[PDB]
Amino acid sequence: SSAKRKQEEKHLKMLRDMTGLPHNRKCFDCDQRGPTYVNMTVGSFVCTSCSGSLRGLNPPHRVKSISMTTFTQQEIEFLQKHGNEVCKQIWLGLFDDRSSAIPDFRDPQKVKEFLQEKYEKKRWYVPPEQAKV
């Protein structure tokens, strides 16, 4: 459908507005490369390797392909209200970019433990209400 097409392409335009924002240009979890997936659980943009590790959490985070998913209006709007800068202030609100503890990202076991500390144990976490203000 053309009406279907119209909304689909609008969502992709909105998506590419977001993928060009500076914090969204690098994976939220490793900061080492460009994102290929969105992590819908928290509203971040992540790379494939980190997406694989996020699926190893329990419960696992929900990742969807940037290029292949047909995102809904609800999902696009959630992402607009989140993204990597908003997420940084929450999940990494206490993290110091110079020296806070990061894994060797070539190691899946260490990346798992790190993602657990980040999201489950909330080692560097500032609650969203505070983070926003």
Among 18, 27, 90, 92, binds Zn ion (CB under 5 A): 27
Q: Which stretch binds Zn ion (CB under 5 A): 12-20, 44-52, 66-74, 90-98?
A: 44-52
Least Å distance, CB 17 to Zn ion, is 22
Distances in Å between the Cα of 41 and the Cα atoms of 27, 45, 60 are: 15, 11, 9
Among 14, 30, 40, 57, binds Zn ion (CB under 5 A): 30
Q: Give contact residues for a second copy (rule: CB under 8 A).
A: 2, 5-6, 8-10, 12-13, 15-17, 19-20, 22, 25-26, 34, 67
Q: How many residues bind Zn ion (CB under 5 A)?
A: 5
Report residue 9 as tokens.
């392409």
- Calpha distance 85→91 (Å, rounded): 10
- Calpha distance 94→89 (Å, rounded): 8
Q: Tell me if 42 contacts Zn ion by CB under 5 A.
A: no
Least Å distance, CB 62 to a second copy, is 23
- SS percent in the chain: helix, strand, coil, step 5: 50, 5, 45
> Given its phi and psi angles, is residue 67 left (phi above 0), alpha (psi -120 to 50 degrees) or beta?
alpha
The residues of the shown chain that bind Zn ion, judged by CB under 5 A, are 27, 29-30, 47, 50
